[PDB]
Amino acid sequence: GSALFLVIFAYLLGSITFGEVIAKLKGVDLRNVGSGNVGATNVTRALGKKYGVLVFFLDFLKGFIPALIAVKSFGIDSWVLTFTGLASVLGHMYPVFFGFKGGKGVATALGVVFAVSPSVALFSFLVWLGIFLWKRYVSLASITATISAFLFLFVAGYPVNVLFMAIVIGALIIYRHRENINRLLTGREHRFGTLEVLFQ
Numbered sequence: 001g002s003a004l005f006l007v008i009f010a011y012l013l014g015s016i017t018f019g020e021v022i023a024k025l026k027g028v029d030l031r032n033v034g035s036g037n038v039g040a041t042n043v044t045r046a047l048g049k050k051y052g053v054l055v056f057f058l059d060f061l062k063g064f065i066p067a068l069i070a071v072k073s074f075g076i077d078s079w080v081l082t083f084t085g086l087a088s089v090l091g092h093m094y095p096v097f098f099g100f101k102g103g104k105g106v107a108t109a110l111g112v113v114f115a116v117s118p119s120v121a122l123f124s125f126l127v128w129l130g131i132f133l134w135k136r137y138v139s140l141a142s143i144t145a146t147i148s149a150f151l152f153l154f155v156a157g158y159p160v161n162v163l164f165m166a167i168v169i170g171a172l173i174i175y176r177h178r179e180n181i182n183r184l185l186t187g188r189e190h191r192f193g194t195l196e197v198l199f200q
């Protein structure tokens, strides 16, 4: 009852593609910029860091806020958390309000994980930092951090409902990165920071 409302709410909230909304407000088409994706990284390319960080936090809250409610109302070990977390990410990836063409789910999924375990969220972000500072590819860092998030939850002893949530979310995130992976493998993935050292 209240739980089915929470899952539907999570999917519909997730289905608000904030990057596209703010881009439209600014008169920019995100599909014509950079990677053509609609999440915070390509928002930064199209609109600047201010708007990318804003979209990061909105996409994060899409996952954090419903999952937090599931955690406090039903428990981390409830399949209501599993379905609320999945609904958030599935709405972000396949938004009912935007032709089912969404983002890749990194920020939203981090929000879900933060609601379950701030420590696991921190560790996964630490993995992300290392991989990003090393190779300067957002995609490579997100893929590695996504795999690590699942290992962290597995090794820390979280229950099956959480591991089910994490392996489906994780597999979906990696699959949504398949074009980045093809670019990585062929050497035309966008890389950060090479020319900026001439201005430092």
Ligand SMILES: CCCCCCC/C=C\CCCCCC(=O)OC[C@@H](O)CO
Binding pocket: 001, 002, 003, 004, 007, 074, 080, 083
């Ligand atoms: C296109 C994919 C559709 C598949 C999703 C189908 C619905 C998935 C999960 C069920 C929604 C949440 C209901 C949970 C619920 O009411 O549990 C709480 C209650 O039983 C007592 O805690």
Ligand SMILES: CCCCCCC/C=C\CCCCCC(=O)OC[C@@H](O)CO
Binding pocket: 040, 041, 042, 044, 049, 052, 053, 056, 110, 114, 118, 119, 121, 122, 125
């Ligand atoms: C346990 C306490 C710390 C846990 C850390 C969990 C994750 C929290 C913060 C990291 C997010 C940084 C937000 C900025 C960011 O990445 O913006 C997206 C980027 O596209 C902007 O250019």
Ligand SMILES: CCCCCCC/C=C\CCCCCC(=O)OC[C@@H](O)CO
Binding pocket: 041, 044, 129, 138
């Ligand atoms: C030795 C010090 C290690 C590095 C310290 C890191 C401090 C923690 C967080 C910094 C916030 C960065 C959030 C993510 C971010 O902005 O990604 C870079 C972005 O430009 C990629 O598109």
Ligand SMILES: CCCCCCC/C=C\CCCCCC(=O)OC[C@@H](O)CO
Binding pocket: 009, 065, 068, 069, 070, 072, 073
């Ligand atoms: C339908 C939600 C609309 C947006 C509301 C956003 C609220 C975000 C964070 C505050 C949540 C507070 C805790 C909610 C909860 O499940 O509490 C249960 C328990 O702590 C007391 O019964």
Ligand SMILES: CCCCCCC/C=C\CCCCCC(=O)OC[C@@H](O)CO
Binding pocket: 007, 011, 083, 086, 087, 090, 091, 094, 099, 100, 101
């Ligand atoms: C499953 C647990 C509760 C969450 C239910 C939310 C509904 C889930 C997914 C939305 C529909 C699935 C999207 C199918 C798909 O990929 O279609 C192709 C797509 O790229 C559209 O062109």
Ligand SMILES: CCCCCCC/C=C\CCCCCC(=O)OC[C@@H](O)CO
Binding pocket: 039, 040, 041, 042, 056, 105, 106, 107, 108, 109, 110, 113, 124, 125, 128, 138, 142, 145, 146, 147, 149, 150, 166, 167, 169, 170
């Ligand atoms: C198996 C579930 C995994 C859920 C979390 C997966 C990712 C975990 C940590 C990495 C967070 C990186 C945040 C910084 C960043 O730039 O993120 C990518 C950005 O485009 C926002 O989506």
Ligand SMILES: CCCCCCC/C=C\CCCCCC(=O)OC[C@@H](O)CO
Binding pocket: 135, 140, 143, 144, 147, 181, 184, 185
């Ligand atoms: C560092 C280990 C990460 C393991 C998980 C990520 C594996 C998934 C996709 C990556 C496929 C291509 C590997 C990355 C790559 O080619 O990077 C470009 C490289 O030549 C130098 O930046």
Ligand SMILES: CCCCCCC/C=C\CCCCCC(=O)OC[C@@H](O)CO
Binding pocket: 167, 168, 171, 172, 174, 175, 178, 179, 181, 182
């Ligand atoms: C437990 C399974 C959950 C299923 C949810 C959806 C899973 C979809 C794909 C599995 C992950 C593979 C992603 C990596 C991948 O295929 O990258 C290769 C890509 O370059 C192919 O063009």
